[PDB]
Structure formats: structure tokens, C-alpha cells
Amino acid sequence: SSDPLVVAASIIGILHLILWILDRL
Amino acid sequence: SSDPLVVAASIIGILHLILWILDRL
Amino acid sequence: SSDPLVVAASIIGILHLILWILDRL
Amino acid sequence: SSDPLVVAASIIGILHLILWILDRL
Numbered sequence: 001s002s003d004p005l006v007v008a009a010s011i012i013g014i015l016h017l018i019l020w021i022l023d024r025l
Numbered sequence: 026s027s028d029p030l031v032v033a034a035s036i037i038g039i040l041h042l043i044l045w046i047l048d049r050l
Numbered sequence: 051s052s053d054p055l056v057v058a059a060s061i062i063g064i065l066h067l068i069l070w071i072l073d074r075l
Numbered sequence: 076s077s078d079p080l081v082v083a084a085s086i087i088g089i090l091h092l093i094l095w096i097l098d099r100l
């Protein structure tokens with residue numbers, strides 16, 4: 001495993017991408 | 026701990042998310 | 051190498067940048 | 076040091092923030 005801030009941030013940068021893309025569509 | 030660029034960047038990707046979301050609302 | 055979530059996220063933050071920039075233009 | 080993809084990505088997430096903020100203003 002890695003540290004929970006690093007991992008958490010990673011997931012965020014995925015979720016925030018979907019939201020942004022969804023908004024555009 | 027980790028390195029301050031890595032950690033700092035992590036926090037940014039959270040703050041930038043809130044700002045973006047807040048703007049949408 | 052590093053872990054595939056970390057690396058994958060890195061690439062995303064690049065692709066998402068291009069898309070955003072392209073949209074602005 | 077860390078790996079150049081990780082570091083590079085970190086900087087990007089800062090630059091992309093400024094650009095986004097500047098655009099809003």
C-alpha cells in the first residue's frame with residue numbers, strides 16, 4: 001500500500017475528471 | 026512523511042476540486 | 051517503476067489538462 | 076529526488092490551477 005492522502009488524491013483526480021466531462025456533455 | 030511537493034500537490038487537488046464544485050453550484 | 055494507480059493518475063492529470071485547454075481554445 | 080513523471084505531474088497540477096483561476100477572474 002501507499003499513504004492515504006496520496007491514494008485519496010489519486011481517486012479524486014479521477015472522480016473530478018468524470019464530473020468535468022459529464023458537465024461538458 | 027512524504028516530500029512537500031507531493032503532499033502539497035495533493036492538497037491542491039482537493040482545494041481546486043471544491044472551488045470548481047462551488048463555482049458550478 | 052511505481053504503483054499503477056499513482057502512475058495512472060499522473061497521466062490523467064495530463065490528459066485532463068489538454069482537454070481543458072483545447073476546450074478553451 | 077523522486078521520479079520525473081510524479082514530479083512533473085505535481086507541477087502541472089499547480090500550473091493548471093493558476094490558469095483555471097486566472098480564467099475565472
Ligand SMILES: N[C@]12C[C@H]3C[C@H](C[C@H](C3)C1)C2
Pocket residue numbers: 006009010013031034035038056059060063081084085088
Ligand atoms: N493530481 C495528482 C494528485 C496526486 C499528486 C500528483 C500526482 C498524482 C497524485 C496526481 C498530482
